[PDB]
Amino acid sequence: SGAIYVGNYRVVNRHLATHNDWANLVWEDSSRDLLVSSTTAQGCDTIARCDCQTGVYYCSSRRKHYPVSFSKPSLIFVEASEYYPARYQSHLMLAVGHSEPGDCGGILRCQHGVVGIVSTGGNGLVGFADVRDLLWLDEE
């Protein structure tokens, strides 16, 4: 589990969104595994605006932050799970790291700020849903 709290937005994995998220919806994209809902309180996370390919992510199944090298956001084949059928997920970045069921939502961050959230795992891989192109997270 986990979210990005930027301005009056909450950024979560679409597959983990709550009823309150759906009742306060700003934007959702199944192809990216992302959903954004509105918040009453202002958050403290800042979004990175960059093409960093190194950073650090939080792994809840280890209680550890790991430094990683990750691929540029791409259209990556993702295997069928309890949340989605076999499909191409867009804006996904891959790294080598521990990610098991429950690690989705952990933040990936670089020197500039938050890059994305854990969205895939297994096989000693971890995938991150990129948020750096969502410029609207910074206003309104």
Ligand SMILES: NC(=O)[C@H]1CCCN(C(=O)c2ccnc3[nH]ncc23)C1
């Ligand atoms: N965005 C998606 O389509 C996700 C949905 C959750 C599952 N998933 C994984 O890649 C995954 C996550 C955690 N541990 C794992 N072990 N084996 C596979 C996995 C795909």
Ligand SMILES: [Zn+2]
């Ligand atoms: Zn950066």
